[PDB]
Amino acid sequence: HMLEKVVIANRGEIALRILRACKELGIKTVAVHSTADRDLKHVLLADETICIGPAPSAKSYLNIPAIIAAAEVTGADAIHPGYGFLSENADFAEQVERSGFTFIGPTADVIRLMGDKVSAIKAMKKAGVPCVPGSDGPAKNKEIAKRIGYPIIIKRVVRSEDALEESIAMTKAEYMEKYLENPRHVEIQVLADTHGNAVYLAERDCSMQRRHQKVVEEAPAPGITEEVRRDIGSRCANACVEIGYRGAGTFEFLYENGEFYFIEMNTRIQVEHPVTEMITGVDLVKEQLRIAAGLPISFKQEDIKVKGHAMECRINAEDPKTFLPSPGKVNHLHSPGGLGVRWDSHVYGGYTVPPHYDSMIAKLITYGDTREVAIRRMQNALSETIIDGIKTNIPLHELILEDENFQKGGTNIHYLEKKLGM
Amino acid sequence: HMLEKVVIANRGEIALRILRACKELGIKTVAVHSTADRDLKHVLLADETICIGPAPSAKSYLNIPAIIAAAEVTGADAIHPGYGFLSENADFAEQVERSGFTFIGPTADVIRLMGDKVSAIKAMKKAGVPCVPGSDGPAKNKEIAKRIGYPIIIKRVVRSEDALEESIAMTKAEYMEKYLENPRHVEIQVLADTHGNAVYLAERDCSMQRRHQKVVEEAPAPGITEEVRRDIGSRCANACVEIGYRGAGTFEFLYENGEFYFIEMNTRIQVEHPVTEMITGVDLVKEQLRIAAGLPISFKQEDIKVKGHAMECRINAEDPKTFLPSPGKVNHLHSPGGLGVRWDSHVYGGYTVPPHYDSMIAKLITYGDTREVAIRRMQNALSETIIDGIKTNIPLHELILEDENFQKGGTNIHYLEKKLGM
Numbered sequence: 001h002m003l004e005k006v007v008i009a010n011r012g013e014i015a016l017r018i019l020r021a022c023k024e025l026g027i028k029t030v031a032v033h034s035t036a037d038r039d040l041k042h043v044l045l046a047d048e049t050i051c052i053g054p055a056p057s058a059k060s061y062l063n064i065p066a067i068i069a070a071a072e073v074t075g076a077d078a079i080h081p082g083y084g085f086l087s088e089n090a091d092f093a094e095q096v097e098r099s100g101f102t103f104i105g106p107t108a109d110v111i112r113l114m115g116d117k118v119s120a121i122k123a124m125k126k127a128g129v130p131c132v133p134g135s136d137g138p139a140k141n142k143e144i145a146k147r148i149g150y151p152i153i154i155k156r157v158v159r160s161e162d163a164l165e166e167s168i169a170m171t172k173a174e175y176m177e178k179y180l181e182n183p184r185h186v187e188i189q190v191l192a193d194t195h196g197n198a199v200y201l202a203e204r205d206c207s208m209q210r211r212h213q214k215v216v217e218e219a220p221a222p223g224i225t226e227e228v229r230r231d232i233g234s235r236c237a238n239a240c241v242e243i244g245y246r247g248a249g250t251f252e253f254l255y256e257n258g259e260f261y262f263i264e265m266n267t268r269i270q271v272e273h274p275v276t277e278m279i280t281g282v283d284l285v286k287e288q289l290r291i292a293a294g295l296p297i298s299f300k301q302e303d304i305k306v307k308g309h310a311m312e313c314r315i316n317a318e319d320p321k322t323f324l325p326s327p328g329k330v331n332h333l334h335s336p337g338g339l340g341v342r343w344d345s346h347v348y349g350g351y352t353v354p355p356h357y358d359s360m361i362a363k364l365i366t367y368g369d370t371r372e373v374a375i376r377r378m379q380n381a382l383s384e385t386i387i388d389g390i391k392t393n394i395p396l397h398e399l400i401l402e403d404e405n406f407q408k409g410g411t412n413i414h415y416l417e418k419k420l421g422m
Numbered sequence: 423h424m425l426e427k428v429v430i431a432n433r434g435e436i437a438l439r440i441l442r443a444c445k446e447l448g449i450k451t452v453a454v455h456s457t458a459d460r461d462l463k464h465v466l467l468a469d470e471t472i473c474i475g476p477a478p479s480a481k482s483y484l485n486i487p488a489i490i491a492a493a494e495v496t497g498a499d500a501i502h503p504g505y506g507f508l509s510e511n512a513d514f515a516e517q518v519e520r521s522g523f524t525f526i527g528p529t530a531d532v533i534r535l536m537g538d539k540v541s542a543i544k545a546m547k548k549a550g551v552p553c554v555p556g557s558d559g560p561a562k563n564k565e566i567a568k569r570i571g572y573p574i575i576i577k578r579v580v581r582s583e584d585a586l587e588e589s590i591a592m593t594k595a596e597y598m599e600k601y602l603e604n605p606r607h608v609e610i611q612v613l614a615d616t617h618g619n620a621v622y623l624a625e626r627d628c629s630m631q632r633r634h635q636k637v638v639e640e641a642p643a644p645g646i647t648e649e650v651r652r653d654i655g656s657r658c659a660n661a662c663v664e665i666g667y668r669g670a671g672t673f674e675f676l677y678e679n680g681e682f683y684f685i686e687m688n689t690r691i692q693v694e695h696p697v698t699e700m701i702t703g704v705d706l707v708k709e710q711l712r713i714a715a716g717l718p719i720s721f722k723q724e725d726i727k728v729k730g731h732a733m734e735c736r737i738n739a740e741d742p743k744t745f746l747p748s749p750g751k752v753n754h755l756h757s758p759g760g761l762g763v764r765w766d767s768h769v770y771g772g773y774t775v776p777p778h779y780d781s782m783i784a785k786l787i788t789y790g791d792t793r794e795v796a797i798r799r800m801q802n803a804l805s806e807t808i809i810d811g812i813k814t815n816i817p818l819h820e821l822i823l824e825d826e827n828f829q830k831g832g833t834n835i836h837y838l839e840k841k842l843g844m
């Protein structure tokens with residue numbers, strides 16, 4: 001009569017993370033996997049396994065009917081979608097609850113609401129979560145653009161009135177907003193339950209990115225005071241209640257000259273959740289599972305106090321210079337350890353990284369009482385880490401961590417790409 | 423003009439632990455090693471290496487003149503002795519400071535004081551650290567034994583007056599005290615610096631033992647209240663000042679029917695220090711190094727608050743049934759991870775555990791907000807851990823953790839051996 005068995009509708013490290021939380025709560029696990037993933041750590045640990053299709057994503061991890069049949073055939077109570085794949089797919093969520101299983105995440109209606117940009121802004125704007133100034137929806141655009149103020153983003157970026165009508169038409173065989181020139185990425189973690197509670201769990205800075213993909217994340221964000229945290233955090237907790245949010249989620253902002261501007265709500269657990277765990281002492285995947293089971297969040301807002309600092313390096317099987325993937329056999333893995341070092345990875349000596357999915361192989365997470373200690377622990381853990389047989393982006397991480405502007409802190413979302421050009 | 427280079431006068435996991443702290447502080451390392459240990463993780467990471475002798479302990483890690491020459495030839499500032507080997511050897515400490523290097527630990531005089539039992543009791547007794555009732559030093563023994571009260575320990579244990587004089591003479595070709603029948607082992611961690619400060623860092627319960635060797639340790643100790651902690655802890659901090667203690671140390675007690683009875687001060691870092699780290703947020707090996715450099719302890723007593731619970735399983739290369747050592751090649755090591763899991767080990771896939779030293783190969787440390795969470799995390803981390811090629815005592819740990827009396831908590835120092843007999 002509660003959650004007793006959970007289908008893990010994902011793979012790789014987050015599938016292992018979920019398995020770990022399940023096993024801590026005594027929840028039975030069902031590992032659904034493609035034919036290429038029979039040797040995943042979490043498949044090998046799972047109570048039951050069901051092969052849901054051949055290697056390609058389309059035919060396996062995105063196979064909505066096979067994943068639902070796997071829940072049916074095992075007698076499962078709930079499905080955890082992880083991140084990526086179907087986690088923000090409303091049709092999947094809708095179909096999961098229509099077949100009577102618990103979807104571990106928000107309701108389908110809320111996924112669609114926060115899954116479309118204009119709709120999401122409206123809803124934030126009404127909740128009093130600050131958005132980027134814009135036209136709100138939808139000749140008079142010379143003037144709309146006027147008052148928003150150049151530069152403008154139709155999405156092109158647009159620096160001249162001359163060329164408004166062009167960039168209007170150019171994106172328009174392919175809405176307007178203030179283009180923020182050099183913002184950081186600062187995001188707020190929340191949880192909301194079926195007992196009407198919602199909390200905020202400080203913030204993460206994920207400004208170090210390449211091609212919009214995050215490389216290094218940290219928590220808390222440098223420069224953000226407790227006062228400021230409280231303001232923005234409590235606006236997000238409130239937004240959660242207004243929209244009947246449920247489960248873990250993240251409000252992503254562009255943050256520039258002291259102000260927050262909303263850009264997306266990821267309605268799911270994120271890759272970078274561990275850094276918030278380390279600074280708050282909250283188990284975010286456990287709380288997902290509890291909340292899905294109908295439990296209240298296990299603590300109150302005044303129980304949450306940011307303590308110390310945490311960093312995460314996404315370790316990828318890829319050439320550190322060209323960023324082309326590097327699948328193949330890991331002959332040896334020597335993973336780092338010691339105080340303040342956490343290692344979240346499904347990779348082991350003997351394991352073959354397949355070509356079929358993303359290239360993330362491990363997340364290396366460090367914690368310290370200060371940002372400087374956490375960066376130093378990261379540097380030392382990276383130098384101890386050996387992954388023999390394939391190439392990784394460890395060398396990129398080492399360059400970032402020794403960057404003087406990174407050490408000062410507060411570098412913007414373009415920094416990595418500039419650095420890399422220089 | 424400070425500590426810039428440290429000789430790590432030890433091996434195995436604690437040598438790696440020390441290396442890690444050194445590297446966090448930017449302190450150069452000198453790995454002194456025997457010929458059998460050239461492939462130790464910490465030797466491979468060290469800035470400088472010096473081979474101090476052939477495989478046997480006697481000729482290498484206990485070679486006082488070779489270790490001192492290694493400090494001389496490298497231009498080192500200090501020597502960290504770890505635990506075991508020379509760490510409680512006053513002659514070594516005396517000779518290290520007489521050759522002008524900093525010994526990372528207390529002064530030689532203090533090692534001898536707390537290194538001999540009668541002397542240590544005197545000094546504790548004068549400090550107001552509670553000792554076990556006894557004769558204090560040294561016919562009239564029928565009566566001394568009388569008032570201490572049977573049962574008695576000459577060290578034999580002695581249950582009858584009849585047989586006092588015998589057991590007197592029997593141990594006396596080979597002092598008296600109350601024999602505590604079913605105590606737990608509860609120990610208090612301290613630090614003391616050259617600025618006149620001394621602190622206590624709660625306590626550990628290390629009652630699960632076999633042949634007097636510890637298997638599982640935890641912190642805090644079940645049943646001990648904050649009130650009680652404060653009392654006993656502050657008596658140990660005070661004892662530290664009275665004796666001019668310096669560095670990390672531990673006061674070990676036998677704890678029975680609500681009372682603490684002193685049995686030894688280990689004047690060094692201990693194997694089981696990590697569990698205290700996890701519950702207090704203190705880096706105990708860093709503080710050793712700071713304190714040795716002449717710095718104050720980096721926090722005050724009121725900054726220390728016990729939060730959560732931690733467990734440590736000493737993973738040994740040994741047959742889990744006969745406890746005979748199992749040296750040889752580890753073909754694969756798959757180490758556990760995830761939230762609340764810490765792994766302290768110099769072992770890696772490819773590494774050969776030699777026969778020459780102890781059988782400890784890794785310490786698996788878990789943390790949780792409650793004792794139950796920490797035990798469950800331990801169980802799950804052990805089930806994920808693979809060490810292929812040699813035998814380990816993991817099966818023993820799994821049996822302990824599933825023991826109902828262990829789960830209730832507070833089992834005594836004889837429990838494991840009884841359990842094992844049953």
Ligand SMILES: Nc1ncnc2c1ncn2[C@@H]1O[C@H](COP(=O)(O)OP(=O)(O)O)[C@@H](O)[C@H]1O
Nearest residue numbers: 132153155177178179180181212254263264413
């Ligand atoms: N107002 C803005 N100013 C500057 N850059 C923006 C703005 N809005 C969006 N962008 C850029 O485009 C990116 C695309 O948004 P994102 O949520 O990452 O899309 P997706 O989540 O589908 O990849 C943003 O991170 C940001 O870097």
Ligand SMILES: Nc1ncnc2c1ncn2[C@@H]1O[C@H](COP(=O)(O)OP(=O)(O)O)[C@@H](O)[C@H]1O
Nearest residue numbers: 554575577599600601602603634676685686835
């Ligand atoms: N008063 C006592 N009552 C019961 N057992 C004792 C008492 N004193 C010592 N012992 C036993 O003998 C052990 C030997 O002490 P210990 O400090 O371990 O010696 P070493 O450190 O040299 O191995 C103690 O842990 C304890 O189990």
Ligand SMILES: COC(=O)CCCC[C@@H]1SC[C@H]2[C@@H]1NC(=O)N2C(=O)OC
Nearest residue numbers: 011012014083084085270271272357358
């Ligand atoms: C093995 O394949 C998987 O388990 C899914 C692959 C990762 C999905 C991407 S990574 C960056 C982005 C997506 N998920 C996520 O949380 N991200 C995150 O930072 O939020 C944007």
Ligand SMILES: COC(=O)CCCC[C@@H]1SC[C@H]2[C@@H]1NC(=O)N2C(=O)OC
Nearest residue numbers: 433434436505506507692693694779780
């Ligand atoms: C690889 O060899 C070494 O690094 C030294 C071996 C261990 C010394 C023993 S284990 C239990 C005891 C000794 N050190 C220690 O701290 N112990 C501890 O619990 O305090 C009694």
